[PDB]
Design a protein around this ligand. Structure first.
Ligand SMILES: [Ca+2]
Ligand SMILES: [Ca+2]
Ligand SMILES: [Ca+2]
Ligand SMILES: [Ca+2]
Lengths: 594, 594
């Protein structure tokens, strides 16, 4: 039970240069209290001063709610519009309570010591929520709407990308179990059910997204963009950066990908040649070490390159934040692409079909159905042990490593422990959950019992991430978006690529020489077939109008209906009898002489 | 100079059943004059009664203009909104003058003798317009906007699809002349310039369309649909037809296409075998007759099948008129597809590559560069002679075939000659102008001097159609639409198909056997390349925002801006000085003991 605290600002004051710190502290307190929010000061841990803020006069906040609530009517966020009477008719949920206060602390008014503004956690909510998700098997729609209020939309959107990827993994699980029991291995009919399913999930998601963004009322938030504060500009007109200076910096991404093809490629050369060096030249030390080299070497080489990619993203300047996450993810996607697939491509397209010709520079049948075992059993239980147990143990032994006070002796002892954690972001979870999908879309026909093991690691990741957010990471500052950023696009590229490599595989590792002809014809057939079932499920799933969408078109019409119903509410042979007389006259005149 | 007449209704009364005709005539006159428009009666020609209507009280018409002008604000046709004051601020153009009167004559109120309602022509406008288009080479944007006012939007839209297809034919003309002079015949570099150009024209058109539909203010008219009056319905809910009865009728289209593959295919078997029958077994009668068999046999076999296709479209019932032209065109497209290409496919994919194997059931090099000469010189000058000269001669000799009267002796003699003509539709012109594009998109690399002859038959068709509308067809009843109906889609299919067949051709009629390998690899490369340059010109031509579009986003904002600016216009350590005092105290308290 927090003491009504809405935010906590850190304001670290070090030993050196501490004389520009007290005046800057007064500059912080005055600028905070002119906005209209109270302040308190406690101790930190070593040299810091945890400043506590909350809103004080509820009328200024209730008008502040209105000052953006009828800002959302302006830019076409929602259609409807409600004199400070937005509290009883439709209340303020805990998204809009904590976002607008965060919009009052950082503002364009129309600081090199503040470490990190961060909200607090309510632990009376956590032991209900993490328990009640673990006694259910499925999850209802109304339980995701109980995670929107307390965390935001962009944290609540990832849990709806998981739930609607759960229940579409049950199709190629069961029809993947059949192709492990009934049909033989590497068969073509699995390579089109996995070809068909990777459009039905991808297109039923893009229709469920614009429905579920209507019901929350945040449909058009991607149209508005706001300025990132670290933007630079030479001369204003709205500000502008010289765009030809961005071409000189964006081109350095090509020596990043050129470093990416050689770095993650260097590990598989270490993996392949150490496999032979321990084979020919401790017998049980030979079969346990190339596993333990690949689980401790890979997330270090993916750490130093992504940290180099995060540095390249800040040097390449960007204007808007929506164009900032559209370039961090692409420079991070190619990095995690060549790390979690170039151990698998080189086995299936070079090692197993060309195992005769590469030999003077035999072939064993136990590698492609064994390396796919790696990325499905032992590279997930080393991941679930790392994503939860390692930070929980690292923070528990660190708690023992230490060397008005009525209830504040414990309330400071909760919030001081918070600020040494990391801010949880749903960028990394989407990057994993979009990389894991690949295996069951490109390299799945090489071992058709891959879906039925991924469906048990998404009934735990649906509650592992619910555990990680509340025991090992401070609450994310709530944001709003409509779709899953740029992830949806690079989800499409993991569909077409999955439908090509898969077709080539259903032909090589199965005509006597199996090369040139059947291979190219099979890939062309499986590619053209994809580009035809990407239209029919763009045609069946486009004549089905959603219920939500009705709530937009009616209220657009009904408001437009109500708006104008509260504001308005020569040859002259004249004589209509004269005209019909000659009409009955002329038609008999034409028929009394013929 | 017409006498203010806005429409002419025919009302043909025959010999038999003429007793239900005078009472029905009075039923016509009364229902016309209760709407509020005057009536006059003249003679017809043989048994008819040309009824003349015009609007009488300009206040009822000026409110009728408003009754749909603020109907267009309701359904989101345009954003802006102007008490019968829509005459001086923005006047009524001659589209909206003649459409609304036509919307008063046919109405849902909220007749088996009336032949055809049709507007009249102003011949003081025609001799200016057809002359002034023939003294210019190019055409300015402001001259197409002088054809919108007098004819509509859907007649004025076809002249903007021609003008922006004129000036993009100048690219593969000049770079087609080079591939006839510099480079050799059947070269691959022409097969990608024709591959690139068929996206740049197709994507620059779809961007110029939403611009030019903004400036006319008819942007969203395709969203509204209205009921076709000949619709049937069993039980209402808005009415509804049983949709499973439509599946029983729509399936009969498959025996139409199955009749289409055999009928137009039967003519080329007649073309091929009569060529040999006159070759072996009058020397100048041998080289002139297979031309004269193909120009008089083809538009008869395309007449009886399209008339069968028009009968199938009326039997298959449809609700809305927008779903009526989306099924007449598709059933007419496949008919004109297999007639103007299956004489050309069978030559280029069977005759010239497989000329050895088919021979016992030699090969000559003079057929593919001679049959492409047919569809470019002699099948256009037989078409321009048919589209203009034949109906003008047929109507001139028919004028000699005949067997209050102050100025009405000549004014009846103009309007009586009108009603025996045909109602001009821009469906057929789009069908031709979309079929002719194919030759320069699929079969163009087989004879790279095809564009430079199509660019002189579109400087005449740009004024032949301007001649046909005013000398040989009554004025079309003005309509409104935003895009070129369903033509734009089946324009896209003529792009991908053009990029495949063309790639196969650049490999067959040019490895020694030229088969299986290079062929499939070349088509795959030219198809994948297409699907990559369909993204870059969906990315360069999508970061360029149009000027028109600015006029929508500002006036949406400025109205929304103006609308709300004309209606509105605990731990308590209180004392901001107390808070900053302990703040300067604690940071020294933490640094007077360390
Ligand atoms: Ca995981
Ligand atoms: Ca994870
Ligand atoms: Ca023509
Ligand atoms: Ca024509």
């Amino acid at each position: 039970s927090n003491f009504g605290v809405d935010f906590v600002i850190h304001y670290k004051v070090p030993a050196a240069e501490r004389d520009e710190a007290e005046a800057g502290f007064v500059q912080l307190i005055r600028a905070l209290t002119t906005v209209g929010l109270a302040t308190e000061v406690r101790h930190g841990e070593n040299e810091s001063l945890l400043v506590f803020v909350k809103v004080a006069s509820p009328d200024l906040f209730a008008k502040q709610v209105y000052r953006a609530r009828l800002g959302d009517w302006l830019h076409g966020v929602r259609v409807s519009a409600p004199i400070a009477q937005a509290l009883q008719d439709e209340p303020v949920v805990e998204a809009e309570r904590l976002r607008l206060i965060y919009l009052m602390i950082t503002k364009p008014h129309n600081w090199k010591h503040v470490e990190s503004i961060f909200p607090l956690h309510s632990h009376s909510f956590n032991k209900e929520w993490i328990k009640k998700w673990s006694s259910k098997y499925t999850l209802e729609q109304t339980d995701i709407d109980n995670i929107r209020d307390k965390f935001g939309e962009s944290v609540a959107f990832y849990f709806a990308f998981l739930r609607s990827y759960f229940r579409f993994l049950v199709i190629p699980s069961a029809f993947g179990f059949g192709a492990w029991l009934l049909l033989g291995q590497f068969s073509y009919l699995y390579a089109l059910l996995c070809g068909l399913w990777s459009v039905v999930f991808f297109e039923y998601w893009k229709k469920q997204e614009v429905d579920l963004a209507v019901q929350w009322g945040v449909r058009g938030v991607s149209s508005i963009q706001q300025s990132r504060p670290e933007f630079e500009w030479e001369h204003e007109a709205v500000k502008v950066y010289p765009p030809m200076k961005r071409v000189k910096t964006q081109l350095l991404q090509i020596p990043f990908a050129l470093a990416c093809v050689v770095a993650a490629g260097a590990l598989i050369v270490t993996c392949n040649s150490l496999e032979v060096f321990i084979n020919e030249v401790g017998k049980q030390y030979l079969g346990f070490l190339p596993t333990i080299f690949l689980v401790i070497g890979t997330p270090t080489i993916s750490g130093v390159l992504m940290g180099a990619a995060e540095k390249l993203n800040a040097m390449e300047n960007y204007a808007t934040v929506d164009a900032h996450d559209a370039a961090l993810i692409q420079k991070q996607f190619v990095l995690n692409f060549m790390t979690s697939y170039m151990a698998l491509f080189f086995t299936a397209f070079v090692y197993i079909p060309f195992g005769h010709i590469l030999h003077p520079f035999q072939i064993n049948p136990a590698r492609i159905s064994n390396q796919m075992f790696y990325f499905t059993v032992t590279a997930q239980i080393v991941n679930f042990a790392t994503e939860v147990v390692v930070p929980y143990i690292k923070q528990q032994a660190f708690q023992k490593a230490k060397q008005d006070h009525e209830e504040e002796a414990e309330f400071l002892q909760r919030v001081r422990e918070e600020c040494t954690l990391e801010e949880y972001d749903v960028s990394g979870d989407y990057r994993e959950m979009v990389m894991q999908f690949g295996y069951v879309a490109m390299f799945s026909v090489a071992w058709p019992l891959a879906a039925c093991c991924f469906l048990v690691n998404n009934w735990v990741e649906l509650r592992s991430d619910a555990l990680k957010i509340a025991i090992s990471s401070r609450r994310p500052i709530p944001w709003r978006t409509d779709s899953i950023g740029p992830w949806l696009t690079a989800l499409s590229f993991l569909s077409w690529l999955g439908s090509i490599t898969s077709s080539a595989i259903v032909y090589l590792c199965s005509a006597s020489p199996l090369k040139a002809w059947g291979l190219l014809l099979s890939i062309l057939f499986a590619e053209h077939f994809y580009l035809v079932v990407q239209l029919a499920v763009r045609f069946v799933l486009s004549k089905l109008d959603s219920p939500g969408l009705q709530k937009e078109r009616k209220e657009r019409f009904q408001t437009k209906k109500r708006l104008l119903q509260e504001n308005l509410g020569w040859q002259r042979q004249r004589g209509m009898q004269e005209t019909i007389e000659i009409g009955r006259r002329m038609i008999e005149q034409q028929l009394a002489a013929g």
